[PDB]
Amino acid sequence: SRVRQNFHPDSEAAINRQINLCLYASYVYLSMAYYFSRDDVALNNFSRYFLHQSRCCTEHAEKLMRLQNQRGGRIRLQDIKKPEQDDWESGLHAMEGALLLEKNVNQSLLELHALASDKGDPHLGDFLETYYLNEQVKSIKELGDHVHNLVKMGAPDAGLAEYLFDTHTLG
Amino acid sequence: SRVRQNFHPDSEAAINRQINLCLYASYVYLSMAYYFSRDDVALNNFSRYFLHQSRCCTEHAEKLMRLQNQRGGRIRLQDIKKPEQDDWESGLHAMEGALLLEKNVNQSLLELHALASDKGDPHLGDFLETYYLNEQVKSIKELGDHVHNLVKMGAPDAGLAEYLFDTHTLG
Amino acid sequence: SRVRQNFHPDSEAAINRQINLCLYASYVYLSMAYYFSRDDVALNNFSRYFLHQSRCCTEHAEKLMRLQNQRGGRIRLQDIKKPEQDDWESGLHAMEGALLLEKNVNQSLLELHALASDKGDPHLGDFLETYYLNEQVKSIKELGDHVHNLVKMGAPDAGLAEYLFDTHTLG
Amino acid sequence: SRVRQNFHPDSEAAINRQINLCLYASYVYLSMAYYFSRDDVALNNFSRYFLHQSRCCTEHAEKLMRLQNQRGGRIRLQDIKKPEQDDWESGLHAMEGALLLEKNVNQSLLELHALASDKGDPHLGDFLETYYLNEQVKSIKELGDHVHNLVKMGAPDAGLAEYLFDTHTLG
Amino acid sequence: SRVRQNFHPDSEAAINRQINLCLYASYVYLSMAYYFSRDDVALNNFSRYFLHQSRCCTEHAEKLMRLQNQRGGRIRLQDIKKPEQDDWESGLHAMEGALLLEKNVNQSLLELHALASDKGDPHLGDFLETYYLNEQVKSIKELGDHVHNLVKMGAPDAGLAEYLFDTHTLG
Amino acid sequence: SRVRQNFHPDSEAAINRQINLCLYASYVYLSMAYYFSRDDVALNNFSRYFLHQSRCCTEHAEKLMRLQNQRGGRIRLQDIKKPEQDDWESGLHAMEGALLLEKNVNQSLLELHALASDKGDPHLGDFLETYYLNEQVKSIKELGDHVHNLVKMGAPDAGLAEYLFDTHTLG
Ligand SMILES: [Au+]
Ligand SMILES: [Au+]
Ligand SMILES: [Au+]
Ligand SMILES: [Au+]
Ligand SMILES: [Au+]
Ligand SMILES: [Au+]
Ligand SMILES: [Au+]
Ligand SMILES: [Au+]
Ligand SMILES: [Au+]
Ligand SMILES: [Au+]
Ligand SMILES: [Au+]
Ligand SMILES: [Au+]
């Protein structure tokens, strides 16, 4: 590419892997969003919350695709794997699944940053720091908060817990 | 499900297949969108055009997921297959690929409508007619228009054709 | 902590030390602020200037406390030592004391950044770069400017110097 | 000091002690504020509530420093001791700790007022009455209200109590 | 300098070299801008485009001069060399020359960043990342886009190519 | 050139020399501007004043480049020489240097006008009269005013002089 400069083939490949992972995380969140609008779950603010999470991950996936083009890399898409479950069991189980998902996404981003550093690619390092790493920390912290409150309130077995959390925290 | 009524298991399964197909079509269009923002393609209104196509297909996929929940069906997600190509070759090739994609999506919707009719599900039939069938006809017609003009202008080999089409029709 | 990831115990401890140092710097500046509103000093814009410096350091201390929580560390507070003097002697002496204070704070931040780099913590490195390191450089530069002008004007012994600097530069 | 009049050295010293105590109370409240934004506590309106308490105590400390200067006294700062705990255990425990803290601060203010009266310093007595004594009574009453409601709701062991109090009373 | 801290003499010297290079790039772009307003070239949006490029490089040069002062370095100016050509031959030749110029400027910035990293100067590294490295990537990508479209349209020999590109892309 | 009329080759060459001289004067003023934002000079309105002088000279250089194109001449750029000093010593020394610079620029413009008159080029003569000669007289007069006041105030050795001039005249 006539724009390519200081852009290692390993970084290009790692960006393509991260694109797939952010698309996958978007899909997991979409699955969770529509679990909570089932007639036998019906927690509409959990639904809205995870739909917003899904949009955020889609935006980050697209920004990585833009980055690939900006640097002269070439996007290579792969299948987006279906999520591990269609039935997410409870508000608490979904929040815990989201927390684990984001820590896995965070680990991948940190490994991508370490690669960028190894290859002396400060543009890529800054891109990750500016748009990904602190956003990931904020989301993980928020999910941790939500898990804590749900557990303390007695979710999933206490009948009022997820209902009240849906209407107060996620409202 | 305590909401389920007149909703055949075959229709539920066929809705799950259509959800996957609309997500797949969304992915194809996303792939096309970022092909046109490559530095060696750089047709930004083709890029915008296919990104909009992608959003429309995502909306239709989500509306089918909502429908499944509304009727008491259960969403079952599957892998979203990667598109057939990462390199879409030209503006004309992409428009022709999109036209073929939409005719395939349209055929699936029409088969879904025929199933709904066979199972005496007028709610499902109306849902498809109201939100899917005429939108598909409009999009196919528009893609046909675009293919015709691109071919007549001399795309892909004529150097001004896709450039001028990008700036005039898709601008 | 269920949110903790890639966060080294040394970094957590170093953050707790920096919190104490930023609180201490806030206290020094508060002391300076109220020195200049003594009836036998009465330089109200020096007073306002150092009060603003104090608020800025309090904000940075709180942002480090927020960071500790965001990353799953645990805040451990220590005594905030009283400043070295209650009588800051003159506008020039206070500005020189502030310059030395900020260089000490800056050195601590740079050592914290070097630790973050050693521990492969790019989130922490970026946090320091984004919110602390350039703000410190700007403040040190401004204090250098003020010291230069005060010295050139003949502070502290020239009777008009601090009075005129208070009303023109700090007004 | 050429402004000093009817201002007893004991009152000056007692004002310096009260400044340290109000700064200490500010620090305790800051500690409490950031306890409630831990991922394993996550009661953000408790956090906001105690942060506001902290700002109020900082304002009262500064107003005492202003008073010292207004009367021709000389501010003598001392170390601000760290709070007794970093882990405040629960919303109820923190509210009870705050109530005890404010009664101790109130006792010190009342002793300061008695000193002012003994030394025939009505300006100092009025300053305390106008800006400190009724504000202290209001805050103690409010903390008493909060403690009562938390206890009645079943805090800290009842899972919904602090969550609901956070969102309704402190929201 | 009484403000100088953690600022290596090599970094100071390298900043002075980068200032000259950004001023030089500004001069090249100014030369290109007025080539396109010749009566025998007369592509006024090419002219505007390169004038804007020139202003951007002047701003970056001045920001490096500000940085030198902020850190306590001392600006040392050198001759600004005249550009390689006064006659830039065509819109396509100028865009290709600009692309090569920016890659050379980018290489210098990346080497400056590597120096900052070697000398443990995170303030300088962040300054380059925040204000220079991503701006350079964006400009190189845009120039790549423009070169691609011009080539595909048949520039410089096809009579309509640069005229149409001037009025559509650069308008 | 098909636009060229009554435009002598000597005038074209002399215009190219004046372009270089106005660019050089712009560079001198830029150097002066950033001398006054050194931490050990820190006269920010001197800095602003000379930056404005620099922009004015850049505008006049560009207007001469436009003139060359308007008349069918061909711009030939040369190196822009670095200024005589990086350290401008004082506000007074810089103002005196600027006065000498502008008289040299003025002499060149007057010689250019005499050439235009010799070659019977009234368009060029009017261009110089309308945009250059009275602007030069105004700037020289202003610099003379500033030099006079600085000298009378006791610059550079009197500590208040440049400080007060910076804040009152140049503010
Ligand atoms: Au993601
Ligand atoms: Au997001
Ligand atoms: Au679709
Ligand atoms: Au659509
Ligand atoms: Au601080
Ligand atoms: Au600040
Ligand atoms: Au207090
Ligand atoms: Au208060
Ligand atoms: Au530049
Ligand atoms: Au720029
Ligand atoms: Au000039
Ligand atoms: Au001017």
Residue numbers in the entry:
A (entry chain A), B (entry chain A), C (entry chain A), D (entry chain A), E (entry chain A), F (entry chain A): 6 to 176
Anything the authors wrote about it?
It is a nearly spherical 24-subunits-protein with exterior diameter about 12 nm and a hollow cavity of 8 nm. Like human H-chain ferritin, the ferroxidase centers of HuFtMt are composed of A and B iron binding sites of conserved amino acid ligands His65, Glu27, Glu107, Glu61 and Glu62. Herein, we take the compartmentalization concept to re-design the intrasubunit interface of ferritin to create a new compartment for fabrication of fluorescent Au NCs, while keeping the inherent protein cavity functional.
Therefore, to create specific Au ions binding site at the ferroxidase center, we re-designed these centers by genetically introducing cysteine residues as potential coordination ligands into them under help of the YASARA software in two steps. Consequently, each 3Cys-ΔC molecule can accommodate up to 48 Au ions. Thus, these crystal structures validated our re-design of the ferroxidase center in atomic detail, thereby supporting the utility of the intrasubunit interface strategy for creating the specific Au binding sites. To characterize the core size, the as-synthesized Au NCs were analyzed by high resolution transmission electron microscopy (HRTEM). We believe that the higher stability of the 3Cys-ΔC-templated Au NCs stems from the prevention of the excessive growth of Au NCs by the size-constrained ferroxidase centers which are buried within four α-helix bundle. Thus, it appears that incorporation of Au NCs into its intrasubunit does not interfere with the formation of iron cores within the ferritin cavity.
